[PDB]
Amino acid sequence: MNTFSSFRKHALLHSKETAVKSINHNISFYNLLLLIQRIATGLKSANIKKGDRISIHMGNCFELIATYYACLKIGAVFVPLSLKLSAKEVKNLIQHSSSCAYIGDKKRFYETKQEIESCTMLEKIWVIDLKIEDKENNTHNWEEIISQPYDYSEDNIYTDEIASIFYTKGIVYSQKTLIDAVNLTKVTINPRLPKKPAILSLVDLISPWSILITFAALQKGYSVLLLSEVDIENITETLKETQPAWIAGTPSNFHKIIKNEENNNNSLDLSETVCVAGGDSCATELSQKFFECFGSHLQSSYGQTELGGPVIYHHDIYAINEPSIGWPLPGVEIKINNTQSSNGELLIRSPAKTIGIWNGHDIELFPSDRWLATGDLVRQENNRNLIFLGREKDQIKIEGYPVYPIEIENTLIQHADIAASVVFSVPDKYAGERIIALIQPQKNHSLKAETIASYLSDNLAHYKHPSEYIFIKEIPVISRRKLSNEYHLLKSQAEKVFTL
Ligand SMILES: CCc1cc(C(=O)O)c2c(c1)C(=O)C=C2
């Protein structure tokens, strides 16, 4: 069982349950399968064949998930085009990917029309809500692909065959890569037992992590809630109405949800809700601000397209007082380049092996034993939790020993008088580097400098101690490199500078 057959099995055994819903629409598992079958028939009637690449370019809608599944059913290689791409970058990917067809919605197509319609290898262009005067040549209305009943034609799909290309470099997934990537993602979707759960991903469904989440949720029998851009702009209001059991988002997504409660009397109840902050870093500081706002125990996921899917999962960030990213998922193997130290660079190999990189003309094959160098520094505890020591380019050297800003910042944020902090170093003639702490005092809370110093005496080794404190009422926009370059400016704008 491949990804489409897994969906079809659950769809046919739980046919009347809701598979996908929006605020004002819903489709059952069975009716979703019927839509998928119609699209497949339309694709094959348009002479789309196995191995043909199809660029997909649309916002969150039921047709997007059905189109993925229709591509999987007939073996058409789907190529999702991020909504963040300009018209210029969209056309480049259509050309680079050697796509011969394109499926998009009205908003994205009309932003991109000449570019799309000037890619001459595109035999078919299907647009949801295509305007009638634009039905001509190879541009078709989406209705034409579903106008014909399912023809019950068979499909021979094999696990080694290409399934999709996800551009960061076009990362090629086989059917097996997707099976294994969804299997990793399934382990990270753990809604609480309802006293039926709906899954929400705030990342666009065109983006690989949401694709995997959606497959994984449907295969577990959950419904998937799809939100529009305006729905997410009004996320607190949307959440109060839709009440999903599980929410994936960026750290920025959840920071926004926290901010909205400050100014919205009627509190949103996320206490039963399981929330997963997804990224390539650590969510420890977010998790604890997230707990005293909502009483919810934030989780995190760590992965990237080159590793197939999520590879490291923290099912309870707030339970670990040090910054940490969690535990390798099943089959995930790690290596820490920590020669002669306890801390080192995290190297990962994933059980979801991507096939290679599409370079326009050939697939650059990956030796399936290759490790990925993350650029992140870790230490592995006895229980195999990965303590997160930050971004390797951010480490500081003090008397030869490495110092990790993320670690100092996590200690600093524990103080109630500190709203936020950023630690970085500046050059120093005879010490090499000097540690600076940029401290943001909590509003109203009166400042107070040696308190920080004495606090840090009690909690970090001396060599990690900042040599200097810059008190600033707002920290600029975070890149410790840029702030280090602005060190003299920061001091001149500072409300106070304390030098030890
Ligand atoms: C599909 C590969 C993948 C991509 C991304 C991303 O945010 O780009 C993420 C993860 C996996 C993840 O586990 C949390 C964030």
Short mmCIF file of C-alpha atoms and ligand atoms in Angstrom, two decimals:
data_model
loop_
_atom_site.label_atom_id
_atom_site.label_comp_id
_atom_site.label_asym_id
_atom_site.label_seq_id
_atom_site.Cartn_x
_atom_site.Cartn_y
_atom_site.Cartn_z
CA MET A 1 0.00 0.00 0.00
CA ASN A 2 0.86 3.31 -1.43
CA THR A 3 -0.58 6.66 -0.40
CA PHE A 4 -3.67 6.59 -2.65
CA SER A 5 -4.55 2.96 -1.85
CA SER A 6 -4.24 3.71 1.87
CA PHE A 7 -6.69 6.59 1.49
CA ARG A 8 -9.07 4.52 -0.64
CA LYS A 9 -9.08 1.71 1.92
CA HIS A 10 -10.03 4.02 4.80
CA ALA A 11 -12.40 5.99 2.58
CA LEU A 12 -14.33 2.84 1.66
CA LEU A 13 -14.52 1.55 5.24
CA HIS A 14 -15.63 4.90 6.78
CA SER A 15 -17.40 6.35 3.79
CA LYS A 16 -19.89 8.65 5.53
CA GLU A 17 -17.50 10.35 7.95
CA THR A 18 -16.29 13.86 7.16
CA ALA A 19 -12.88 13.87 5.48
CA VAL A 20 -12.32 17.58 4.80
CA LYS A 21 -14.13 20.69 5.96
CA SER A 22 -13.91 24.44 5.71
CA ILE A 23 -15.97 26.97 7.58
CA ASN A 24 -18.97 26.57 5.25
CA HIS A 25 -18.35 23.30 3.41
CA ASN A 26 -17.54 19.66 4.03
CA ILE A 27 -16.93 16.51 2.01
CA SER A 28 -17.25 12.94 3.25
CA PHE A 29 -14.52 10.32 2.82
CA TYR A 30 -16.67 8.57 0.19
CA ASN A 31 -17.53 11.70 -1.77
CA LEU A 32 -13.89 12.79 -1.64
CA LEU A 33 -12.94 9.45 -3.21
CA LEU A 34 -15.56 10.01 -5.94
CA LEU A 35 -14.07 13.45 -6.71
CA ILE A 36 -10.55 11.96 -6.85
CA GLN A 37 -11.75 9.31 -9.30
CA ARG A 38 -13.40 11.89 -11.57
CA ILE A 39 -10.22 14.01 -11.67
CA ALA A 40 -8.18 10.90 -12.51
CA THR A 41 -10.53 10.11 -15.40
CA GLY A 42 -10.33 13.68 -16.67
CA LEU A 43 -6.53 13.60 -16.48
CA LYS A 44 -6.33 10.39 -18.50
CA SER A 45 -8.88 11.69 -21.01
CA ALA A 46 -6.57 14.69 -21.51
CA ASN A 47 -3.77 12.19 -22.40
CA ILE A 48 -1.94 12.77 -19.11
CA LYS A 49 0.13 9.63 -18.55
CA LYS A 50 2.14 8.03 -15.77
CA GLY A 51 5.34 9.98 -15.14
CA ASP A 52 3.90 13.20 -16.58
CA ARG A 53 4.58 16.16 -14.31
CA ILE A 54 1.73 18.48 -13.27
CA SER A 55 2.35 21.86 -11.64
CA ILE A 56 -0.21 22.59 -8.91
CA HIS A 57 -0.77 26.19 -7.87
CA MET A 58 -3.71 26.89 -5.57
CA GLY A 59 -4.85 27.92 -2.12
CA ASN A 60 -6.49 25.66 0.45
CA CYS A 61 -9.54 23.92 -1.01
CA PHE A 62 -10.97 20.43 -1.34
CA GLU A 63 -9.83 20.29 -4.98
CA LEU A 64 -6.20 20.61 -3.90
CA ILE A 65 -6.21 17.47 -1.75
CA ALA A 66 -8.31 15.58 -4.35
CA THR A 67 -5.86 16.62 -7.09
CA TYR A 68 -2.87 15.27 -5.11
CA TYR A 69 -4.68 11.97 -4.69
CA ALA A 70 -5.73 11.86 -8.34
CA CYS A 71 -2.09 12.35 -9.37
CA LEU A 72 -1.05 9.54 -7.02
CA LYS A 73 -3.78 7.23 -8.35
CA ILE A 74 -2.56 7.41 -11.96
CA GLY A 75 1.11 7.99 -11.25
CA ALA A 76 1.29 11.60 -12.41
CA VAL A 77 4.12 13.45 -10.68
CA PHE A 78 2.67 16.41 -8.80
CA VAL A 79 4.76 19.57 -8.46
CA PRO A 80 3.34 22.05 -5.91
CA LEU A 81 4.20 25.70 -6.58
CA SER A 82 4.45 27.72 -3.36
CA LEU A 83 2.08 30.67 -3.06
CA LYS A 84 5.08 32.75 -1.95
CA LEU A 85 6.57 32.54 -5.46
CA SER A 86 6.44 35.47 -7.84
CA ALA A 87 5.02 35.03 -11.34
CA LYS A 88 8.60 34.99 -12.60
CA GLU A 89 9.54 32.25 -10.13
CA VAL A 90 6.37 30.24 -10.86
CA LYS A 91 7.13 30.09 -14.60
CA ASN A 92 10.74 29.07 -13.89
CA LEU A 93 9.52 26.07 -11.87
CA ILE A 94 6.97 25.09 -14.52
CA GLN A 95 9.80 25.11 -17.07
CA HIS A 96 12.52 23.57 -14.86
CA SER A 97 10.17 20.77 -13.74
CA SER A 98 9.32 19.84 -17.37
CA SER A 99 5.64 19.98 -16.43
CA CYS A 100 3.19 19.23 -19.24
CA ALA A 101 0.07 20.33 -17.36
CA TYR A 102 -0.96 22.86 -14.74
CA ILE A 103 -3.85 22.95 -12.26
CA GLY A 104 -4.55 26.12 -10.28
CA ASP A 105 -7.30 28.26 -8.81
CA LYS A 106 -8.60 31.60 -10.03
CA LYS A 107 -6.59 33.89 -7.74
CA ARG A 108 -3.21 32.27 -8.54
CA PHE A 109 -3.83 31.76 -12.25
CA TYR A 110 -4.83 35.34 -13.00
CA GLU A 111 -1.83 36.66 -11.07
CA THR A 112 0.33 34.49 -13.37
CA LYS A 113 -1.48 34.28 -16.70
CA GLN A 114 1.04 35.22 -19.44
CA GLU A 115 3.83 33.36 -17.69
CA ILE A 116 1.75 30.23 -17.31
CA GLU A 117 0.25 30.36 -20.80
CA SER A 118 3.65 30.99 -22.43
CA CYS A 119 5.17 27.72 -21.15
CA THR A 120 4.84 25.81 -24.42
CA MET A 121 5.33 22.31 -22.98
CA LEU A 122 2.01 22.67 -21.09
CA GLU A 123 -0.55 20.63 -23.02
CA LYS A 124 -3.36 21.34 -20.53
CA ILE A 125 -4.09 24.24 -18.15
CA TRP A 126 -7.03 23.79 -15.75
CA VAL A 127 -8.21 26.77 -13.68
CA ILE A 128 -10.94 26.77 -11.02
CA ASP A 129 -13.42 29.56 -11.92
CA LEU A 130 -11.60 30.27 -15.19
CA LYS A 131 -13.36 33.19 -16.86
CA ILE A 132 -15.30 32.17 -19.97
CA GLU A 133 -13.46 34.48 -22.39
CA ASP A 134 -10.25 32.64 -21.36
CA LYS A 135 -11.50 29.18 -22.39
CA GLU A 136 -9.33 28.76 -25.50
CA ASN A 137 -6.24 26.93 -26.75
CA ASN A 138 -4.83 24.78 -23.91
CA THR A 139 -6.53 26.69 -21.06
CA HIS A 140 -9.56 24.84 -19.65
CA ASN A 141 -12.06 25.33 -16.83
CA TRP A 142 -11.61 23.01 -13.84
CA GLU A 143 -15.14 21.64 -14.46
CA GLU A 144 -13.93 19.93 -17.64
CA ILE A 145 -11.63 17.61 -15.69
CA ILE A 146 -14.54 16.32 -13.56
CA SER A 147 -17.33 16.43 -16.14
CA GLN A 148 -17.03 12.72 -16.99
CA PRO A 149 -17.95 9.78 -14.72
CA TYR A 150 -15.14 7.60 -13.42
CA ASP A 151 -14.18 5.17 -16.20
CA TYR A 152 -12.99 2.41 -13.80
CA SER A 153 -9.72 2.18 -15.75
CA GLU A 154 -6.90 0.43 -13.91
CA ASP A 155 -3.53 1.81 -12.85
CA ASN A 156 -0.28 -0.06 -12.17
CA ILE A 157 1.65 2.02 -9.61
CA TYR A 158 4.93 0.83 -8.11
CA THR A 159 6.63 2.07 -4.98
CA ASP A 160 9.94 2.93 -6.68
CA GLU A 161 8.22 5.20 -9.24
CA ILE A 162 8.39 8.99 -8.94
CA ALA A 163 5.44 10.54 -7.08
CA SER A 164 6.25 14.23 -6.59
CA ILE A 165 8.94 16.91 -6.82
CA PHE A 166 9.15 19.39 -3.92
CA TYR A 167 11.27 22.45 -4.75
CA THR A 168 13.23 24.08 -1.94
CA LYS A 169 16.49 22.24 -6.08
CA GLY A 170 13.64 19.88 -6.91
CA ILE A 171 13.61 17.14 -4.28
CA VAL A 172 12.27 13.97 -5.90
CA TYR A 173 10.00 11.66 -3.87
CA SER A 174 9.06 8.17 -4.96
CA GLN A 175 5.77 6.55 -3.93
CA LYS A 176 7.83 4.87 -1.22
CA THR A 177 9.36 8.17 -0.04
CA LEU A 178 5.79 9.45 0.51
CA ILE A 179 4.63 6.28 2.31
CA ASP A 180 7.64 6.56 4.63
CA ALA A 181 7.26 10.35 5.03
CA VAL A 182 3.60 10.00 5.92
CA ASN A 183 4.48 7.20 8.35
CA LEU A 184 6.84 9.64 10.10
CA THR A 185 4.18 12.35 10.15
CA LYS A 186 1.49 9.99 11.53
CA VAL A 187 3.58 9.60 14.72
CA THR A 188 3.37 13.37 15.31
CA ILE A 189 -0.44 13.78 15.04
CA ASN A 190 -1.83 12.85 18.48
CA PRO A 191 -5.13 14.64 19.23
CA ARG A 192 -6.64 14.12 22.65
CA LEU A 193 -9.41 11.56 23.05
CA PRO A 194 -12.71 13.41 22.45
CA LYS A 195 -15.34 13.17 25.17
CA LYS A 196 -14.05 12.73 15.08
CA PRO A 197 -11.00 14.92 15.84
CA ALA A 198 -10.42 17.60 13.21
CA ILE A 199 -6.79 18.32 12.18
CA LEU A 200 -5.74 21.86 11.26
CA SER A 201 -2.51 22.92 9.56
CA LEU A 202 -1.92 26.67 9.33
CA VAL A 203 0.84 26.15 6.74
CA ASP A 204 -0.52 26.26 3.18
CA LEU A 205 -1.65 22.90 1.84
CA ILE A 206 0.57 23.57 -1.19
CA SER A 207 3.56 23.23 1.15
CA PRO A 208 5.13 19.79 1.77
CA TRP A 209 4.68 19.61 5.56
CA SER A 210 0.93 20.25 5.20
CA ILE A 211 0.69 17.75 2.34
CA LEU A 212 2.15 15.09 4.62
CA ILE A 213 -0.02 16.13 7.56
CA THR A 214 -3.14 15.91 5.41
CA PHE A 215 -2.31 12.44 4.06
CA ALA A 216 -1.40 11.28 7.55
CA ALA A 217 -4.56 12.63 9.15
CA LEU A 218 -6.89 11.16 6.52
CA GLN A 219 -5.13 7.80 6.80
CA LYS A 220 -5.69 7.88 10.56
CA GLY A 221 -9.38 8.61 9.92
CA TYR A 222 -9.32 12.23 11.10
CA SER A 223 -11.03 15.07 9.34
CA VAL A 224 -8.89 17.92 8.03
CA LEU A 225 -9.95 21.54 8.50
CA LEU A 226 -8.90 23.86 5.67
CA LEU A 227 -8.69 27.61 6.31
CA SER A 228 -8.37 30.49 3.87
CA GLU A 229 -6.03 33.46 4.19
CA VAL A 230 -8.82 35.61 5.62
CA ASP A 231 -9.76 32.80 8.05
CA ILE A 232 -6.18 32.75 9.33
CA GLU A 233 -5.98 36.57 9.54
CA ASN A 234 -8.93 36.20 11.96
CA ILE A 235 -7.46 33.06 13.55
CA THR A 236 -8.78 33.53 17.11
CA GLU A 237 -12.32 34.03 15.82
CA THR A 238 -11.89 31.09 13.41
CA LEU A 239 -10.56 28.82 16.18
CA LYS A 240 -13.41 29.73 18.50
CA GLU A 241 -15.86 28.60 15.80
CA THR A 242 -14.16 25.53 14.31
CA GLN A 243 -12.53 24.16 17.48
CA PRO A 244 -10.02 21.74 15.92
CA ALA A 245 -8.47 19.04 18.08
CA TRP A 246 -4.96 19.51 16.69
CA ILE A 247 -3.16 22.49 15.14
CA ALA A 248 0.15 22.60 13.26
CA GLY A 249 1.80 25.96 12.55
CA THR A 250 5.02 27.91 12.51
CA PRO A 251 6.40 29.39 15.74
CA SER A 252 5.23 32.70 14.30
CA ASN A 253 1.67 31.32 13.94
CA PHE A 254 1.47 30.48 17.63
CA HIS A 255 3.10 33.72 18.75
CA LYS A 256 0.28 35.48 16.87
CA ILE A 257 -2.40 33.37 18.56
CA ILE A 258 -0.86 34.29 21.94
CA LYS A 259 -0.79 38.01 21.09
CA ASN A 260 -4.50 38.11 20.16
CA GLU A 261 -5.71 36.98 23.60
CA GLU A 262 -4.16 40.08 25.20
CA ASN A 263 -6.86 42.27 23.66
CA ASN A 264 -9.86 39.95 23.31
CA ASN A 265 -11.84 39.63 26.58
CA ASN A 266 -13.48 36.29 25.67
CA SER A 267 -10.58 33.88 26.03
CA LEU A 268 -9.99 31.11 23.49
CA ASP A 269 -9.82 27.66 25.12
CA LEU A 270 -6.79 25.78 23.74
CA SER A 271 -6.34 23.61 26.86
CA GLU A 272 -7.70 20.42 25.26
CA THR A 273 -6.03 21.34 21.96
CA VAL A 274 -2.75 19.75 20.88
CA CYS A 275 -0.51 22.27 19.08
CA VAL A 276 2.64 21.43 17.12
CA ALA A 277 5.08 24.22 16.25
CA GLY A 278 7.02 23.16 13.16
CA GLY A 279 10.44 24.34 12.07
CA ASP A 280 14.19 23.85 11.91
CA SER A 281 14.97 25.28 15.37
CA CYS A 282 13.79 25.05 18.95
CA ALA A 283 10.44 26.10 20.43
CA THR A 284 11.32 26.00 24.13
CA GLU A 285 10.82 29.70 24.84
CA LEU A 286 7.56 29.76 22.87
CA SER A 287 6.25 26.68 24.69
CA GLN A 288 6.39 28.24 28.08
CA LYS A 289 4.83 31.54 27.07
CA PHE A 290 2.26 29.28 25.33
CA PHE A 291 1.56 27.39 28.58
CA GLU A 292 0.82 30.28 30.90
CA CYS A 293 -1.34 31.90 28.23
CA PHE A 294 -3.40 28.81 27.39
CA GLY A 295 -2.54 25.96 29.75
CA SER A 296 -1.72 23.94 26.63
CA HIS A 297 1.46 21.86 26.36
CA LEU A 298 3.09 22.91 23.10
CA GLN A 299 4.78 20.25 20.94
CA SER A 300 7.27 20.66 18.14
CA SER A 301 8.29 18.94 14.96
CA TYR A 302 11.65 19.17 13.22
CA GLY A 303 12.20 18.13 9.63
CA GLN A 304 12.84 19.24 6.07
CA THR A 305 12.10 18.16 2.51
CA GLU A 306 15.54 16.53 2.03
CA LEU A 307 14.81 14.15 4.93
CA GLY A 308 11.43 13.17 3.49
CA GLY A 309 9.36 14.39 6.43
CA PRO A 310 9.46 15.19 10.14
CA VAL A 311 12.38 13.38 11.76
CA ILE A 312 12.50 14.63 15.38
CA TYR A 313 9.45 15.16 17.57
CA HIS A 314 9.01 16.85 20.93
CA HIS A 315 5.70 15.70 22.42
CA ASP A 316 6.02 18.07 25.41
CA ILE A 317 8.53 20.92 24.99
CA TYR A 318 7.56 22.59 28.27
CA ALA A 319 8.38 19.49 30.34
CA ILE A 320 12.11 20.04 29.55
CA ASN A 321 13.55 23.16 31.20
CA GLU A 322 16.55 23.31 28.81
CA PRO A 323 16.09 24.13 25.11
CA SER A 324 15.50 20.87 23.28
CA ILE A 325 13.98 19.54 20.05
CA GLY A 326 12.87 16.12 21.23
CA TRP A 327 13.34 12.50 20.14
CA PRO A 328 14.18 10.96 16.75
CA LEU A 329 11.08 9.36 15.25
CA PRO A 330 10.92 5.61 14.39
CA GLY A 331 13.66 4.56 12.00
CA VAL A 332 15.38 7.94 12.21
CA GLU A 333 19.10 7.61 12.86
CA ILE A 334 21.29 10.44 14.12
CA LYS A 335 24.99 11.09 14.54
CA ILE A 336 26.58 13.89 16.54
CA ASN A 337 29.88 15.14 15.17
CA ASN A 338 31.08 15.64 18.75
CA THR A 339 34.66 14.48 18.46
CA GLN A 340 36.22 14.98 21.91
CA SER A 341 33.27 17.01 23.29
CA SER A 342 29.77 16.34 24.59
CA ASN A 343 28.19 18.71 22.04
CA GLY A 344 28.41 18.58 18.27
CA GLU A 345 26.68 19.01 14.96
CA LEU A 346 23.51 17.00 14.46
CA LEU A 347 23.73 14.64 11.45
CA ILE A 348 20.55 12.83 10.39
CA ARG A 349 19.54 9.92 8.15
CA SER A 350 15.80 9.39 7.60
CA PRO A 351 13.81 6.23 6.78
CA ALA A 352 12.02 8.35 4.13
CA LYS A 353 14.77 8.28 1.50
CA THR A 354 14.35 10.89 -1.21
CA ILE A 355 15.36 9.68 -4.66
CA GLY A 356 17.51 12.61 -5.72
CA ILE A 357 17.44 16.15 -7.07
CA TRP A 358 15.81 17.16 -10.33
CA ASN A 359 18.27 19.51 -12.04
CA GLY A 360 16.14 20.12 -15.13
CA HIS A 361 17.44 17.20 -17.17
CA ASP A 362 18.35 14.28 -14.88
CA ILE A 363 17.86 13.11 -11.32
CA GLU A 364 21.04 13.48 -9.27
CA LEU A 365 20.75 10.21 -7.33
CA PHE A 366 21.34 10.19 -3.57
CA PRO A 367 23.37 7.32 -2.10
CA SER A 368 20.75 6.13 0.38
CA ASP A 369 23.34 5.97 3.19
CA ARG A 370 24.17 9.69 3.10
CA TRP A 371 23.82 11.77 6.26
CA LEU A 372 22.42 15.30 6.25
CA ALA A 373 24.40 18.00 8.11
CA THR A 374 21.81 20.21 9.82
CA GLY A 375 24.07 23.06 10.95
CA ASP A 376 22.45 22.67 14.39
CA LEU A 377 24.39 21.80 17.54
CA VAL A 378 23.00 19.23 20.01
CA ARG A 379 23.77 17.05 22.99
CA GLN A 380 21.91 13.77 23.46
CA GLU A 381 20.67 12.90 26.96
CA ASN A 382 20.50 9.42 28.49
CA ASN A 383 16.84 9.15 27.44
CA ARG A 384 17.84 10.15 23.82
CA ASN A 385 16.28 13.61 24.02
CA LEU A 386 18.25 16.10 21.91
CA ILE A 387 19.25 19.19 23.89
CA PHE A 388 19.41 22.09 21.43
CA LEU A 389 22.56 24.20 21.69
CA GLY A 390 21.74 26.34 18.75
CA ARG A 391 22.89 27.21 15.31
CA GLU A 392 26.53 26.29 14.76
CA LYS A 393 27.32 29.69 13.21
CA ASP A 394 26.11 31.35 16.45
CA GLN A 395 28.38 29.62 18.91
CA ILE A 396 30.84 31.79 20.85
CA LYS A 397 34.36 30.80 21.92
CA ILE A 398 35.44 31.91 25.41
CA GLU A 399 38.90 30.74 26.51
CA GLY A 400 38.67 28.00 23.90
CA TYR A 401 35.30 26.62 25.17
CA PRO A 402 32.12 26.92 23.09
CA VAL A 403 29.32 29.13 24.41
CA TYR A 404 25.78 28.89 23.11
CA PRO A 405 23.60 32.04 22.99
CA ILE A 406 20.35 30.02 22.96
CA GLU A 407 21.34 28.53 26.33
CA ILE A 408 22.07 31.88 27.99
CA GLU A 409 18.90 33.41 26.51
CA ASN A 410 16.78 30.56 27.90
CA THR A 411 18.15 31.20 31.38
CA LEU A 412 17.61 34.94 31.02
CA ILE A 413 13.97 34.60 29.96
CA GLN A 414 13.20 32.76 33.22
CA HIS A 415 13.49 36.05 35.09
CA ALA A 416 10.13 37.79 35.44
CA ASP A 417 11.66 41.24 34.87
CA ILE A 418 12.96 40.17 31.41
CA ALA A 419 10.50 40.29 28.53
CA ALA A 420 13.02 39.04 25.95
CA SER A 421 16.75 38.78 25.33
CA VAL A 422 19.34 38.15 22.61
CA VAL A 423 22.90 37.07 23.39
CA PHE A 424 25.73 37.56 20.89
CA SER A 425 29.44 38.32 20.84
CA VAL A 426 31.57 41.16 19.50
CA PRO A 427 35.27 41.03 18.58
CA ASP A 428 37.73 41.56 21.43
CA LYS A 429 41.42 42.29 20.91
CA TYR A 430 42.84 40.03 23.65
CA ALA A 431 39.89 37.78 24.51
CA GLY A 432 38.90 37.14 20.89
CA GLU A 433 35.20 37.52 21.65
CA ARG A 434 33.17 39.31 24.32
CA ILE A 435 29.62 38.22 25.24
CA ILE A 436 26.91 40.90 25.06
CA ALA A 437 23.37 40.43 26.40
CA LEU A 438 20.59 42.53 24.84
CA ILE A 439 17.84 42.58 27.50
CA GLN A 440 14.27 43.78 27.03
CA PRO A 441 12.75 44.64 30.43
CA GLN A 442 9.16 43.55 30.89
CA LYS A 443 6.88 46.57 30.55
CA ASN A 444 6.43 48.49 33.84
CA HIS A 445 8.82 46.06 35.57
CA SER A 446 11.68 48.32 36.63
CA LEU A 447 14.86 47.22 34.88
CA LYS A 448 17.54 46.36 37.52
CA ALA A 449 21.00 45.20 36.40
CA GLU A 450 23.11 43.34 39.00
CA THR A 451 20.00 41.22 39.57
CA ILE A 452 20.66 39.69 36.17
CA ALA A 453 24.34 39.32 37.07
CA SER A 454 23.68 37.60 40.41
CA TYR A 455 20.94 35.43 38.88
CA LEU A 456 23.42 34.25 36.24
CA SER A 457 26.13 33.56 38.84
CA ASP A 458 23.71 31.02 40.34
CA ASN A 459 22.69 29.29 37.11
CA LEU A 460 25.45 29.31 34.48
CA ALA A 461 29.15 28.59 34.68
CA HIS A 462 31.20 31.76 34.88
CA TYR A 463 32.71 31.50 31.39
CA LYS A 464 29.21 31.75 29.86
CA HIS A 465 28.48 35.02 31.70
CA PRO A 466 27.80 38.04 29.49
CA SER A 467 30.45 40.72 29.91
CA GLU A 468 27.90 43.44 29.18
CA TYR A 469 24.18 44.21 29.37
CA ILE A 470 22.35 46.40 26.85
CA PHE A 471 18.87 47.31 28.08
CA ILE A 472 16.56 48.15 25.18
CA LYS A 473 12.81 48.63 25.39
CA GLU A 474 12.24 46.91 22.04
CA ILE A 475 14.58 44.45 20.34
CA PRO A 476 14.86 45.09 16.56
CA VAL A 477 12.59 42.90 14.34
CA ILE A 478 16.37 37.74 14.53
CA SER A 479 19.96 37.01 13.42
CA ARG A 480 22.56 37.37 16.14
CA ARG A 481 25.06 38.18 13.39
CA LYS A 482 23.24 41.34 12.35
CA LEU A 483 22.84 42.61 15.91
CA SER A 484 26.54 42.05 16.57
CA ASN A 485 27.24 44.24 13.53
CA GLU A 486 25.00 46.93 15.10
CA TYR A 487 26.57 46.67 18.56
CA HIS A 488 27.68 50.30 18.78
CA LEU A 489 24.32 51.51 17.46
CA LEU A 490 22.48 49.33 20.00
CA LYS A 491 24.53 50.84 22.82
CA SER A 492 23.77 54.38 21.63
CA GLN A 493 20.04 53.62 21.46
CA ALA A 494 20.14 51.74 24.76
CA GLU A 495 18.20 52.85 27.80
CA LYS A 496 21.11 51.52 29.87
CA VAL A 497 24.45 49.78 29.26
CA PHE A 498 26.04 47.92 32.18
CA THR A 499 29.64 46.71 31.74
CA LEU A 500 30.94 44.10 34.21
C1 LIG B 1 8.12 17.77 4.52
C2 LIG B 1 9.43 18.03 5.24
C3 LIG B 1 9.20 19.02 6.38
C4 LIG B 1 9.17 20.39 6.10
C5 LIG B 1 8.93 21.31 7.12
C6 LIG B 1 8.90 22.78 6.76
O1 LIG B 1 8.43 23.62 7.57
O2 LIG B 1 9.32 23.13 5.63
C7 LIG B 1 8.75 20.89 8.43
C8 LIG B 1 8.79 19.49 8.73
C9 LIG B 1 9.01 18.58 7.70
C10 LIG B 1 8.54 19.38 10.17
O3 LIG B 1 8.57 18.32 10.74
C11 LIG B 1 8.19 20.54 10.86
C12 LIG B 1 8.45 21.67 9.87
#
